[PDB]
Design a binder for this molecule. Structure first.
Ligand SMILES: [Hg+2]
Ligand SMILES: [Zn+2]
Length: 258
């Protein structure tokens, strides 16, 4: 029926229902580190997550989202290549069936085990819905995950996945601190792009962190136990929910470091 990541409804078919899939600023893209332009005018990133208020976690059929209360400036992002304040609304992951694939963005063609997306919207627009109608309405912070040592801050998420195994399930998920998922450095690459899932809107200013965070094999294995299907339907493991790199076209990737 509708979109997914299968052979019959995967990324290569999306253009039929969403023509913008073939647009001019689609994501993700491969980050060529030797062609990326170091820009000295880029400001440091400012991440203020101390007053964050997580609310719920849900399995939407294509991934699982952890939602936040965005009714006030509680968890915001500013600085870097951004003008204005951006509010955190939710975060989700993309992962593979094996450790050698899973990330959407790649660095010099290298694929990571998973990629975390922290989604924020420009407050000047009032709400998320109005933000997705503007070229600068969203800011997404992307973080690569590699397999190695366990990430303590990620365990609370891993432990709740059992309760939201199938499509449609949700669970209260309060008091989660996002700061536990940030790498040590905030050096980044930035370029103008889009959401990586339908409707594939081109409203995103991407901020991809250079430093990946490490998670254990046992932790990523938990992600692989989720289901695409709803309860009672035949089981389809939620794996490889990532979109392949898209043509950079008329865009330049800028680096905050050299
Ligand atoms: Hg837009
Ligand atoms: Zn995403």
């Amino acid at each position: 029926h509708h979109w997914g990541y299968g052979k019959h409804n995967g990324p290569e078919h999306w253009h039929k229902d969403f023509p913008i899939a073939k647009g001019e600023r689609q994501s993700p893209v491969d980050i060529d580190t030797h062609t990326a332009k170091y820009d000295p005018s880029l400001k440091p990133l400012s991440v203020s997550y101390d007053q964050a208020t997580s609310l719920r976690i849900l399995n939407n059929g294509h991934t699982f989202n952890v939602e936040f209360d965005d009714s006030q400036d509680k968890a915001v992002l500013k600085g870097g290549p951004l003008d204005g304040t951006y509010r955190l609304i939710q975060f989700h992951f993309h992962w593979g069936s094996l450790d050698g694939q899973g990330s959407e963005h790649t660095v010099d063609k290298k694929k990571y085990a998973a990629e975390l997306h922290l989604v924020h919207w420009n407050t000047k627009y009032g709400d998320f819905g109005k933000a997705v109608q503007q070229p600068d309405g969203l800011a997404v912070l992307g973080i690569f995950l590699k397999v190695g040592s366990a990430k303590p801050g990620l365990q609370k998420v891993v432990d709740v996945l059992d309760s939201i195994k199938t499509k449609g399930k949700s669970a209260d998920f309060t008091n989660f601190d996002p700061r536990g998922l940030l790498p040590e450095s905030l050096d980044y690459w930035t370029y103008p792009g889009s959401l990586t899932t339908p409707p594939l809107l081109e409203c995103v200013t991407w901020i991809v962190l250079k430093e990946p965070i490490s998670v254990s094999s046992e932790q990523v294995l938990k992600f692989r136990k989720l289901n695409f299907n709803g309860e009672g339907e035949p089981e389809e493991l939620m794996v490889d929910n990532w979109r392949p790199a898209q043509p950079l076209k008329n865009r330049q990737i800028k680096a905050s470091f050299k």
